[PDB]
Amino acid sequence: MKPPQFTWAQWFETQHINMTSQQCTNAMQVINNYQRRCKNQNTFLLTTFANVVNVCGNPNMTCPSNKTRKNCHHSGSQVPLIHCNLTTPSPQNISNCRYAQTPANMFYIVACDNRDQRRDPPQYPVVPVHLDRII
Ligand SMILES: Nc1ncnc2c1ncn2[C@@H]1O[C@H](COP(=O)(O)OP(=O)(O)O)[C@@H](O)[C@H]1O
Numbered sequence: 001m002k003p004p005q006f007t008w009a010q011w012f013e014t015q016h017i018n019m020t021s022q023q024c025t026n027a028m029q030v031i032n033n034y035q036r037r038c039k040n041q042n043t044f045l046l047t048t049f050a051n052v053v054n055v056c057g058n059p060n061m062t063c064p065s066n067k068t069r070k071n072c073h074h075s076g077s078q079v080p081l082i083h084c085n086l087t088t089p090s091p092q093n094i095s096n097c098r099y100a101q102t103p104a105n106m107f108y109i110v111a112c113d114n115r116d117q118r119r120d121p122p123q124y125p126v127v128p129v130h131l132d133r134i135i
Helices: 008-016 024-035 049-055
Strands: 041-045 072-074 079-088 098-106 108-114 126-134
Touching: 008 024, 008 041, 008 126, 024 041, 024 079, 024 098, 041 126, 049 108, 049 126
Parallel strands: none
Antiparallel strands: 041 079, 072 108, 079 098, 108 126
16 A cells, blocks of 8 residues: 555655665565555566656556556566565564565566646656556
């Protein structure tokens, strides 16, 4: 889920672009402390927000993860990524969740939408709002 203070684009950035530490256990604390639960799996794309916004400009395609959606876009270029996997689930205390990290270079498919009119900066009319898939 998404904390109230973030727009979908801001939450996308927090979850898949701003890896605050090259270590998943530490990087995931940010996401988990925000959504009050240890996310089982999360991919951090080693790319820039602007790079992803531009991928939103690639042709529209069906979202592999939600076949009814056509707001997805394929990167057209593989990128380095770190995939975090929960190794130590801790529902009674989320700061004790540990993760494994798996490096890879793959393509990414992102769902994009028009920006949150009120909260998203006007600089980017179109923004990524969901990481639909890594292929
Ligand atoms: N590579 C993956 N394989 C399987 N499940 C995943 C993967 N990445 C994330 N998930 C799971 O999918 C759900 C949504 O996460 P995510 O795919 O990152 O979407 P979003 O960008 O909308 O937050 C979470 O339960 C997460 O643990």
